[PDB]
Design a protein around this ligand. Structure first.
Ligand SMILES: CSCC[C@H](NC(=O)NCc1ccc(N)cc1)C(=O)N1CCC[C@@H]1c1ccccc1SC
Length: 164
């Protein structure tokens, strides 16, 4: 079946717990595979040690810029960017996992987890999974954001990987 992956997240060096994500490889296999491999680190790079750099309460928590740590960088397992696979899955509510981008066909490694239904992103950001476990951890991360997106604590993916 679809992969299950995890992110273990700290805030100011204290563990918050684990977010477990189902990757919908049945719908978006290329996008799911990228995220899966960036969690395991098996290509020699990935999410371990990187941050949630933009967090906006009542919107989303964004992470995955493991090269510049500020929303300008990241890279995929395929190359620096890859196309929008499809827009079949929608931003239906809290817990949706979706790709950040800089316009059409600019997926890399940055991603976000929604904390509300974000329907205006449908057709613009590729949804590729959802939170299975750890929404409490996501709500803690969210609480450390601000309207500008600047975080009030240093939020780090200390470990990540594949469960199945
Ligand atoms: C269209 S305005 C830019 C959209 C923004 N983009 C980035 O943060 N882009 C930088 C970026 C993302 C991925 C790659 N590979 C390279 C650069 C982005 O992907 N997202 C995902 C949810 C949070 C943010 C966003 C989207 C729509 C409206 C507002 C916002 S943040 C105020």
């Amino acid at each position: 079946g679809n992969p299950l992956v995890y992110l273990d997240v700290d805030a100011n060096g204290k563990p918050l717990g684990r977010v477990v994500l189902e990757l919908k490889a049945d719908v978006v296999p290329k996008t799911a595979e990228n995220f899966r491999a960036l969690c395991t680190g098996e290509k020699g790079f990935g999410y371990k040690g990187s941050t949630f750099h933009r967090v906006i309460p009542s919107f989303m928590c964004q992470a995955g810029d493991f090269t510049n740590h500020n929303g300008t960088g990241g890279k995929s397992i395929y190359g620096s960017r890859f196309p929008d696979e499809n827009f079949t899955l929608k931003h239906v509510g809290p817990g949706v996992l979706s790709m950040a981008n800089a316009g059409p066909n600019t997926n890399g490694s940055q991603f976000f987890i929604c904390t509300i239904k974000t329907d205006w992103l449908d057709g613009k950001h590729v949804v590729f999974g959802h939170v299975i476990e750890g929404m409490d951890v996501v709500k803690k991360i969210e609480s450390f954001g601000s309207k500008s997106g600047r975080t009030s604590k240093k939020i780090v993916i200390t470990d990540c990987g594949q469960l199945s």
